[PDB]
Design a protein around this nucleic acid. Structure first.
Ligand SMILES: [Zn+2]
Lengths: 213, 99, 139, 74, 127, 59
RNA sequence: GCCGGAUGCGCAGGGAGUGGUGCAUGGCCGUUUGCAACACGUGGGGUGACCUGUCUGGUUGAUUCCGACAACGCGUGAGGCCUGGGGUGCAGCAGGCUGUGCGACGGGCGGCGGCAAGCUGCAGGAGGGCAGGCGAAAACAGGUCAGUGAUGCCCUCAGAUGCUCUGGGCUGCACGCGCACUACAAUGGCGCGGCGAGCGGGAGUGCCGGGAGGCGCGGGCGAGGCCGUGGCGCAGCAGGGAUGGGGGCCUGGAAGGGUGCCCUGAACGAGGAAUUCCUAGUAGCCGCGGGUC
């Protein structure tokens, strides 16, 4: 029994997932792309792709969604047998950081000033229930010198196991007349026992005390 | 003679799988063996952090570990198929040996 | 074989090697007086009867591997007879023993009937069990 | 350049279904249309230059799509 | 009939011991008797335990100790812990218990690592 | 009566068969620092960006 | 050699470039950090920049806390945390494996300090600063355009700064320097016998050969050393193994590569001014395995 063999096949399922998520972002660059999740160990591989719009991405009534599914049957021999992709829209568009990341990318394409762009998102994050949001805009914003302007508010943790639960961060790159601008959006999630809004387990430092009466 | 072999990287998922399968197996048979956990086959990759040679010897170690569970019994092939239909809502990799 | 260990180990060896020389059941090669015994060694063995003394050491290793209920070959056995090679300015790396004389010294242990093969592994036989039994009775 | 035999062989192929080509030019015999690879990429490079098909690149592989708007033209 | 198993260990050297009500006292560590051990420090580190406890407690107890792993010197302290641990575990199972408390207090005052494990493991630094 | 080596005017039949340059990163076209370990075949610099996406934990 | 000089009617323009610019950039990484700092809401002081909050003192690895306080409440970082390590409760299964918990908090005690925070000794205990991980704000003209189907701009594009092939170089050598290796030996070296690890768990076997190596089957591994003992015996000596000669092989298309055999047997007899690293299973010694291949 080989330990080398078992690890190699699992990351083989992993290395296609890294390619596929890299593929979908370039594929749905006109839309908002919010990530994907994969269930590959079954005989039908089920791909859930998260895009802000549902009716546009499926495309000419299931045409282009099967057209992009057709070439994915060709590329990956690992489970070439059965693949099914089905799109979903994010429940809160503010809480996904890529949704806000590609938003200001579209604003910078339209030559909107980034300061007007950045307060538009961090207001929309706060009104959507999220706990804290930092927006980092790096690039040649004014002039040839490049600055890394960093707007922030609210509770955003940086260390702990709660970091991988509670902050979800994004990176989108912008190509303009002047050069390359990178916009990092890192958003803290509100705690909710049902995981549709945030993590189920609380941050470890927070405690609850019952009441004596 | 059935060998139900299942492998998974997430442990809180593969323990929910073996729990509901053992809830399914005791409905079937009482001579069903307990869930046996083989050696967690683990692997590490050590990598330089810098995409250049400006820094100190800063090495980031990434790890993968897959957890294995097994079941052994001697059943009917129709029971093997309804076992097989049970473990497809699970993301754990499933493979079976009938010898 | 518990009574194998109840005598001294090196005192068993010349009692075993002197048995293999007196009974003439291990035969010397042509170049026996000049064998490096490893490519890590710097000299040939200084002992004139080194060949028998190794034949006692190899037959003892097959004896204990039977006591551990384990099978041993010639290539794995050469690793027990390897030294660390003075590699010059490089660090002294461990190297394997010389396989060539170990293979012939076991084939003579097949001719005496001490060692009978089991599958692709040679094993100690009952004849090797008995003839050790008179030896360790005397030590 | 290249013979019109394998030009229209993949051009008739594209009208039913979309093909993807690796940039591995020393690899020959494309997995679908067993033709040398540096042939088949150059004409689809002509197709994007004539603005017919759309090209998406990800990890050494070019995913070429012919959108439905240009399909009825061809 | 009467048989107990206790384990002691140094750094990565683990040692089992089996204590039985044999005919005469004997310690056959790693299938080798105590008088014929090639390493005398292996033999003396067993013998001072017999010197501390006194030979009257080892009246009929046969110790078949096996050891594996570790180097030479950590094998000495592996069996030395395992020899004493199996000695007190025999009295706790098959003999009177207040003598076992008498023996345990004798050994713990003698040296702590005879009966408890040395937690000191090979703790390597990084680069 | 010597064997004449099959291939080019020079000896080798097919280049890119041996050594660094036959292999590349499966993401960024480079011959520099490929992790062939566990059959990954992506480079050192790409493996940071895709590590936890494979299922690797830092820990 | 070859044209990935597409495409719009020789030109236009795209595309390509390990060409240039990291002082045009993204990302990432380094360094400040092996740090303990940073900030808001409101209020107060000042015309104001600012200050207080964020502190006399005490304390802590920590702006950690006690406390006095024109501040009061918060937030990041610190902590909490996550992983491995030791102890054992239960459960399951078969160089034993992996789930689930428990166990340590500085709790107890003594003495200092007393709204104290805490410090310190001992007992108990497997354990009383274990090893890692994530790691704030701000910077730096830090490094990377040679990781990139990340890229602006400039230059090049047919006698090309494109690709590819072959050969050579990156391995040149009066010399300066960094980091390591092996040593200068007797606490040693050499020759046999004996006993022999962990990470990593795929590999042994039979035959040929003096070795390297070869061949044929093929579910399948273990070190320096230490102990015992024989020789040498203070010697540029059986220390040292540099350099070189002749032969045998391996890999590859191709040896300057590796390995093996024999022989030659250099400096080096403890290393100037200087200077690095390190507090316990640690330094050091000693091998082994993995990445590269
Ligand atoms: Zn790469």
């Amino acid at each position: 029994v080989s330990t080398k063999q078992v690890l190699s096949k699992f990351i083989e399922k992993g290395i296609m997932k890294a390619e596929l998520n890299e593929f979908f972002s370039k594929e749905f660059e006109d839309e908002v792309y919010s990530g994907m999740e994969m269930k590959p160990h079954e005989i039908p591989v089920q791909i859930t792709v998260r895009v802000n719009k549902t009716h546009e991405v499926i495309g000419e009534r299931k045409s282009r969604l099967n057209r992009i599914k057709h070439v994915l049957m060709e590329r990956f021999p690992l489970l070439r047998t059965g693949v099914e992709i089905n799109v979903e829209m994010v429940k809160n568009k503010g809480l996904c950081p890529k949704t806000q990341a590609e938003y200001i990318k579209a604003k910078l394409i339209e030559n909107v000033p980034f300061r007007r762009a950045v307060n538009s998102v961090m207001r929309s994050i706060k009104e959507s229930g999220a706990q804290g949001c930092v927006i980092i805009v790096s690039g040649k914003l004014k002039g040839q010198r490049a600055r890394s302007v960093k707007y922030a508010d609210g509770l955003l943790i940086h260390t702990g196991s709660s970091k991988e639960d509670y902050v979800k961060e994004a990176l989108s790159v912008v190509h303009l007349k002047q050069g390359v601008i990178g916009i990092k959006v890192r958003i803290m999630l509100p705690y909710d026992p049902e995981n549709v809004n945030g993590p189920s387990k609380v941050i470890s430092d927070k405690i609850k005390i019952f009441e004596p009466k | 003679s059935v060998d139900i072999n299942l492998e998974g990287t997430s442990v809180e998922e593969i323990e929910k799988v073996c729990r509901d399968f053992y809830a399914y197996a005791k409905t079937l048979v009482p001579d069903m063996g307990g869930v046996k956990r083989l050696q967690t086959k683990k692997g590490k990759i050590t990598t330089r952090r810098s995409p250049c040679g400006e820094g100190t010897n800063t090495w980031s170690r990434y790890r993968i570990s897959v957890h294995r569970r097994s079941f052994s019994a001697h059943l009917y092939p129709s029971v093997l198929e309804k076992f097989a239909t049970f473990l497809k809502g699970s993301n754990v990799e499933i493979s079976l040996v009938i010898k | 074989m518990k009574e194998l260990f109840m005598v001294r180990a090196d005192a068993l060896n010349e009692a075993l090697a002197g048995y293999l020389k007196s009974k003439n059941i291990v035969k010397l090669p042509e170049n026996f007086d000049i064998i490096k015994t490893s490519h890590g060694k710097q000299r040939a063995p200084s002992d004139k009867d080194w060949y028998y003394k190794r034949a006692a050491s190899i037959f003892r290793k097959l004896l204990i591997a039977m006591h551990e209920e384990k099978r041993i070959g010639v290539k794995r056995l050469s690793r027990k007879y390897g030294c660390a090679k003075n590699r010059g300015s490089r660090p002294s790396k461990h190297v394997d023993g010389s396989r060539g004389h170990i293979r012939k010294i076991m084939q003579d242990l097949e001719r005496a009937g001490l060692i009978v093969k089991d599958g692709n592994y040679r094993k100690v036989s009952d004849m090797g069990i008995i003839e050790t039994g008179q030896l360790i009775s005397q030590i | 350049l290249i013979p019109t035999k394998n030009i229209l062989a993949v051009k008739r192929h594209m009208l039913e279904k979309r093909c993807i080509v690796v940039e591995d030019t020393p690899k020959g015999n494309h997995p679908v249309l067993n033709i040398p690879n540096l042939q088949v990429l150059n004409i689809m490079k002509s197709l994007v230059s004539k603005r017919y098909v759309k090209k998406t690149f990800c990890w050494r592989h070019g995913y070429y799509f012919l959108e439905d708007t240009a399909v009825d033209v061809l | 009939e009467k048989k107990v198993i206790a384990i002691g260990q140094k750094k990565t050297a683990k040692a089992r011991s089996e204590c039985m009500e044999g005919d005469v006292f004997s310690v056959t560590v790693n299938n080798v008797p105590l008088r014929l051990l090639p390493d005398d420090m292996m033999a003396s580190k067993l013998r001072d335990i017999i010197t501390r406890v006194g030979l009257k407690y080892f009246e009929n107890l046969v110790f078949s100790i096996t050891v594996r792993g570790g180097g030479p010197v950590s094998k000495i302290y592996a069996v030395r812990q395992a020899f004493a641990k199996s000695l007190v575990a025999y009295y706790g199972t098959y003999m009177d218990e207040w003598t076992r408390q008498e023996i345990r207090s004798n050994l713990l005052s003698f040296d702590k690592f005879t009966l408890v494990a040395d937690p000191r493991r090979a703790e390597p630094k990084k680069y | 009566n010597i064997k004449i080596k099959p291939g080019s005017y020079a000896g080798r039949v097919d280049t890119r068969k041996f050594g660094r340059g036959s292999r590349s990163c499966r993401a960024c076209f480079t011959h520099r620092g490929i992790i062939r370990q566990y059959n990954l075949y992506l480079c050192r610099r790409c493996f940071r960006e895709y590590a936890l996406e494979i299922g690797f934990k830092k820990v």
